[PDB]
Amino acid sequence: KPLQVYTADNQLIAEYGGKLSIPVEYKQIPPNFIHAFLAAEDSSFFQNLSKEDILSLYVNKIFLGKNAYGIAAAAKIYYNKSINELSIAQMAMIAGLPKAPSKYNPVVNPERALERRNWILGRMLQLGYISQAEYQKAVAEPINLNMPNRDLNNIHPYAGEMVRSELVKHFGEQAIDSGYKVYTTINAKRQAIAEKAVQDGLEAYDRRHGWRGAEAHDKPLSEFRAYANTYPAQVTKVNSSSFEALMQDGSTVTVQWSGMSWARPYRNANSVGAAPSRASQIVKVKDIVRLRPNEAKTAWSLVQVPKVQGQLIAINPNDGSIEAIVGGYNFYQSKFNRALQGWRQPGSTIKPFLYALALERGMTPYSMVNDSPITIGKWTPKNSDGRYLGMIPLRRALYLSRNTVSVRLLQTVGIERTRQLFMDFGLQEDQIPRNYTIALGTPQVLPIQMATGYATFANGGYRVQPHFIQRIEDAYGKVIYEAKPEYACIPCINAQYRQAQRILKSSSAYDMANILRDVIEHGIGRSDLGGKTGTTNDAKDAWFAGFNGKLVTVTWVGFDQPTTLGRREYGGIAALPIWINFMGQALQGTPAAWV
Amino acid sequence: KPLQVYTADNQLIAEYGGKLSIPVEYKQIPPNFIHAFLAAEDSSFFQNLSKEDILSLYVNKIFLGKNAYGIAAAAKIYYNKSINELSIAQMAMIAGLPKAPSKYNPVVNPERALERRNWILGRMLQLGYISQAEYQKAVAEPINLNMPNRDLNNIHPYAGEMVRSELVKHFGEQAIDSGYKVYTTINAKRQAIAEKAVQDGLEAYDRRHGWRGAEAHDKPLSEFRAYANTYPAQVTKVNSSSFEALMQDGSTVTVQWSGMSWARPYRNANSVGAAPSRASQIVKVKDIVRLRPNEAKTAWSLVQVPKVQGQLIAINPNDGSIEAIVGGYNFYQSKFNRALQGWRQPGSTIKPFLYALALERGMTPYSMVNDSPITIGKWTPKNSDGRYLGMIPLRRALYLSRNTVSVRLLQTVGIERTRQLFMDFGLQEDQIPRNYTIALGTPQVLPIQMATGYATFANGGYRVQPHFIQRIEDAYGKVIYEAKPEYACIPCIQYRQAQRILKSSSAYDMANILRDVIEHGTIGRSDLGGKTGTTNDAKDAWFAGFNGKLVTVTWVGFDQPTTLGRREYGGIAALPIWINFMGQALQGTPAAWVRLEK
Numbered sequence A: 001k002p003l004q005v006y007t008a009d010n011q012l013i014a015e016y017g018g019k020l021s022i023p024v025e026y027k028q029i030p031p032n033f034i035h036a037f038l039a040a041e042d043s044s045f046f047q048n049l050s051k052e053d054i055l056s057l058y059v060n061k062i063f064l065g066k067n068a069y070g071i072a073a074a075a076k077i078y079y080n081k082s083i084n085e086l087s088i089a090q091m092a093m094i095a096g097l098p099k100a101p102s103k104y105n106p107v108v109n110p111e112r113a114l115e116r117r118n119w120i121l122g123r124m125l126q127l128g129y130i131s132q133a134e135y136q137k138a139v140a141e142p143i144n145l146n147m148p149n150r151d152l153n154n155i156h157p158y159a160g161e162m163v164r165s166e167l168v169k170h171f172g173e174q175a176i177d178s179g180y181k182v183y184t185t186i187n188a189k190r191q192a193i194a195e196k197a198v199q200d201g202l203e204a205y206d207r208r209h210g211w212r213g214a215e216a217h218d219k220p221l222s223e224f225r226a227y228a229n230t231y232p233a234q235v236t237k238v239n240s241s242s243f244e245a246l247m248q249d250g251s252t253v254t255v256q257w258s259g260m261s262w263a264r265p266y267r268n269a270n271s272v273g274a275a276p277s278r279a280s281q282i283v284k285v286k287d288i289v290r291l292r293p294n295e296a297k298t299a300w301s302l303v304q305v306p307k308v309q310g311q312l313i314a315i316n317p318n319d320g321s322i323e324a325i326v327g328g329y330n331f332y333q334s335k336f337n338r339a340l341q342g343w344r345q346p347g348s349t350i351k352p353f354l355y356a357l358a359l360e361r362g363m364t365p366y367s368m369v370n371d372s373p374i375t376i377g378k379w380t381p382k383n384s385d386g387r388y389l390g391m392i393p394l395r396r397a398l399y400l401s402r403n404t405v406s407v408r409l410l411q412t413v414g415i416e417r418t419r420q421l422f423m424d425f426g427l428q429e430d431q432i433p434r435n436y437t438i439a440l441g442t443p444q445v446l447p448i449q450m451a452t453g454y455a456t457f458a459n460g461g462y463r464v465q466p467h468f469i470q471r472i473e474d475a476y477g478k479v480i481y482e483a484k485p486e487y488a489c490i491p492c493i494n495a496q497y498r499q500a501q502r503i504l505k506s507s508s509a510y511d512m513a514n515i516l517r518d519v520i521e522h523g524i525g526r527s528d529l530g531g532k533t534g535t536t537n538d539a540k541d542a543w544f545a546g547f548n549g550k551l552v553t554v555t556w557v558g559f560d561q562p563t564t565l566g567r568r569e570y571g572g573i574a575a576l577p578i579w580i581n582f583m584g585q586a587l588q589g590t591p592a593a594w595v
Numbered sequence B: 001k002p003l004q005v006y007t008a009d010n011q012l013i014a015e016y017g018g019k020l021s022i023p024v025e026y027k028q029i030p031p032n033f034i035h036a037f038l039a040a041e042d043s044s045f046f047q048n049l050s051k052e053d054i055l056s057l058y059v060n061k062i063f064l065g066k067n068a069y070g071i072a073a074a075a076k077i078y079y080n081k082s083i084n085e086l087s088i089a090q091m092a093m094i095a096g097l098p099k100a101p102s103k104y105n106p107v108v109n110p111e112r113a114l115e116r117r118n119w120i121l122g123r124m125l126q127l128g129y130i131s132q133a134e135y136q137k138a139v140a141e142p143i144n145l146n147m148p149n150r151d152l153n154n155i156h157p158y159a160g161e162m163v164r165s166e167l168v169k170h171f172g173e174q175a176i177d178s179g180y181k182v183y184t185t186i187n188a189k190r191q192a193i194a195e196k197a198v199q200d201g202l203e204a205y206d207r208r209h210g211w212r213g214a215e216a217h218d219k220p221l222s223e224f225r226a227y228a229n230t231y232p233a234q235v236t237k238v239n240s241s242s243f244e245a246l247m248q249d250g251s252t253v254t255v256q257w258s259g260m261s262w263a264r265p266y267r268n269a270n271s272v273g274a275a276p277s278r279a280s281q282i283v284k285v286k287d288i289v290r291l292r293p294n295e296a297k298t299a300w301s302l303v304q305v306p307k308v309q310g311q312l313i314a315i316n317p318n319d320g321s322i323e324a325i326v327g328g329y330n331f332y333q334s335k336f337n338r339a340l341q342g343w344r345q346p347g348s349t350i351k352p353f354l355y356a357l358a359l360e361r362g363m364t365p366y367s368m369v370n371d372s373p374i375t376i377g378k379w380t381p382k383n384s385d386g387r388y389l390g391m392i393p394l395r396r397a398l399y400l401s402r403n404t405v406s407v408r409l410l411q412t413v414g415i416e417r418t419r420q421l422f423m424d425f426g427l428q429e430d431q432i433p434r435n436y437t438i439a440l441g442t443p444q445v446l447p448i449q450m451a452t453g454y455a456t457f458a459n460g461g462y463r464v465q466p467h468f469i470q471r472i473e474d475a476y477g478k479v480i481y482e483a484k485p486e487y488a489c490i491p492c493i494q495y496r497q498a499q500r501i502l503k504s505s506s507a508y509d510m511a512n513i514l515r516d517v518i519e520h521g522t523i524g525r526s527d528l529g530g531k532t533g534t535t536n537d538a539k540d541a542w543f544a545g546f547n548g549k550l551v552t553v554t555w556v557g558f559d560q561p562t563t564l565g566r567r568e569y570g571g572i573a574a575l576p577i578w579i580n581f582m583g584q585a586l587q588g589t590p591a592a593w594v595r596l597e598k
């Protein structure tokens, strides 16, 4: 009974196997397997009937490491075999594990394991259980691990892993052994859209930054893996306008000029070389490249896995339901989920929060704010363009992200009142400094926390908690957990007990939502959308946080090791296209839904 | 449901607790405990109130290290507390364990444990779960582990551990979690006798070789343990005829001259110094000594834990039932079991086996054998006393353990026939050389193997297998295992008949040679036979003996082979232990001898 993961549309997306026990009838056990146990220790005081008799009481229970309880579970976990498919050497390997299933474990100590195994094999021979022929064959046999994957997550990988890693982080490995059916809030259609939007958007950034050369040269093709619809290939012949490449299935393909002409060489983030004029400028024979076929598989193109990373998080602003989550370019690259674990600075993307606090004090979007030079101790917060617009409306100050106005508003609204608000918005106390730079978007945040914050605007001023579990059923069919979330608007559900806490005045949240809608309509065929771009120092991060009354989406683009994305790569350039693509498709065929 | 260890007499002597889970109703959990779990991680995506509802599904299952499954089992294992007796700091400590019950465990990483705990306490404060008063109190609170012992083995330690260690060696730690009742072959009365006989015998050897000085000097008293009716004490004041010592309970005691005057100093294995004339010659202030009190209490005496080791193994020669087992001086001094793990040379104790084969070939105890110098290619075996008795009867050659006669009999018998016999009674093929020195007792053996050997004489020529399990019951009362041993004599008690490894007449004649050896070369008994043994430079002292109902093998020696002394023999050293045990174990039982079946 594995841990089962479902989307909100009843689709089984992942299965997590825990502690495994496959009981077998004693008479079904190969005699050599019993012999391997009998030879595993020099002396039994319980040729020797008694140990065989007492072995039958433990044979399906013995902890053999790596979640294996009993001989059948070990045969499955280690070799993906039935006990009847095991070789003498593999039987001797398993029989050496009861004593210390870590010291003699073949996964952790392969040397120490073979030492123990060969000793048992030698003893099986001395005891007459095996012939010298069987013995020589078995000692020469390598470890031969064929460990099946028991963590099945090949449909919506980020969504599946979110469940396993969270249960394990909070409740440890026993959470998987439970055999529970976890019904998530994940919308499979929206999840599929998000995965494609992040892939396309990262590839769009990547391509405009240029060809970075083959990922490897003169390395074995078998050491590479396909992912994100990219297939490792080896360059075998280079011509003037085309090249030949060897695939992982042994077939040779040809890439025509049209499939590689895009390859202007990357020089740095703000520079690409001249458009290629010959295939020899792009590839060398023995290069390990990535290719992509078309739908028919009649044509192939030279592609590139982006070095840049990204994420997308989409929540329901009324209850905090996580509808879609993408934590990187592709889950094969690494299990790392940037939506939940990726601490980055939010930049201008934090301003709607602070400005909503100014609106709380009695200001209006039209209220005049002062964009002039300022000082705190010695520090001078300067504007992006080194310009000062003087007295301007609050809404224009926000749209143009004026840093002196922000610092001035922080002084008006007080640091602590803002820190408490950032905390109400979802933000971590420890990650929020007790200084004036917070008005700038200096606190490190998680994209999920930003989504929670933007939901306050979409919902009318309420604090919602992001959640991914709708219900949990036991293996026997009983509902053991039903989500009871805090709702911003209870009448809104029935287009439910817990009412969410109001963290912002209704009028301030509504005003900020409309400023955000005006911002998105001065920088999809929809009129119910609002949003804010963000970019950090030296374009180390590109953000877009936006919403409608039914859905909040936060997109991020950047390198894991903070490096410039490029002079031209503002939040509005790199993150915004991902947001648009997802939102346009996720909201296609839904009526206008404002605050 | 722990693993229960029982004696043949249906008496519980040990309990082994495995994986523990004490389920609790959610409403019975202190709110601060739930708060500690809520504060254990920065973000929950299941404030964060949803984690509370999901926590109820895991609260009795969460693996918290050291066999603890669930909050109540951790409160018990770590603090011997109920969840309602836990402090805020202890609740924060437990709540920090789910993530990594090894990287944050207070038993293994106390530094990492406190780091994680204090962080959780800090977060409980920031979340408003605890006041600053509750917080300052809790951070200042030390680890405060009060771990109850769940491996109860304080009655017959070597017997209890034999069961736990064997199940764990063959079937791993899951063997304990099974909740099975093991009804063993151990006789509690005989086991109690054996423990006392080994202790007394080792102490008798020890005392005559002199005072070796305190076991430690300027070391912490808390690092020592009481065992074998010896209590660690620290010398605090030394006078002319007496000394003051600090006990583990904090009380100061006085040892008078009478309690320490025995302390002639050990000079070497064959020498002791002058009798002490003042307490300063025996003890220094800050010395870690062992003391012993009266039957009630009035005075204390300076005692010494022997450096010498010993063992005793007693089996039933008809089925191989292990009736008594003592693996060393004290299980608390050394967990190691010399009866089952102590590979040593048997010396002259092997001779009855070789001489028995010579009887199979048609020789009689009276047959003349040649005790003269002999050369086996390169090797020249010499006799113990460097004497040669010439033509002597086979039985006298055995009694006086004549090495040249043994080598001559090995040539008559043949190495392989001998090796086959050694293997037949349990000796290990790898431990038996393919040379003439085997006649002298050079193969490395276990005392349990020697007991199995000597049972062939007591039973009339049969191979029995030593065994400690009579039956196993599950927690629900069902018999899941019943011993089906090989019996030497079935009418004597399915049923399994043991294999004959020696001729009835050979076993009978060797038994009577052994009887003569014990009756006329050393209890009010005439049904006993036995053999002494001593190895080169008295590195080992043995006594293997029996009656028709019981075989006992005793051994004395140092773990790192060193001489016992010139005088220290068979002897002398291992024989008094055997006598003491046998005399008492057989007290009130009729005469029991072997049976001839030509």
Ligand SMILES: *C(=O)[C@@H](NC(=O)/C(=N\OC(C)(C)C(=O)O)c1csc(N)n1)[C@H](C)NS(=O)(=O)O
Binding pocket: A345, A346, A347, A348, A349, A384, A400, A401, A403, A440, A441, A442, A533, A534, A535, A536, A537, A538, A539, A570, A571, A572
């Ligand atoms: C908003 O994201 C805003 N960015 C900034 O205030 C920050 N850097 O801006 C400069 C121009 C210095 C840059 O080098 O990009 C900033 C805030 S916190 C941090 N680490 N950097 C931009 C200007 N507004 S947007 O509308 O262009 O996104």
Ligand SMILES: *C(=O)[C@@H](NC(=O)/C(=N\OC(C)(C)C(=O)O)c1csc(N)n1)[C@H](C)NS(=O)(=O)O
Binding pocket: B345, B346, B347, B348, B349, B383, B384, B385, B399, B400, B401, B403, B440, B441, B442, B532, B533, B534, B535, B536, B537, B538, B569, B570
């Ligand atoms: C038998 O145990 C017999 N001992 C010997 O043959 C051995 N050593 O004897 C000497 C005298 C050297 C000794 O110091 O004890 C011997 C056998 S195997 C080995 N490594 N050494 C003794 C003397 N006879 S008994 O009657 O005491 O058993």
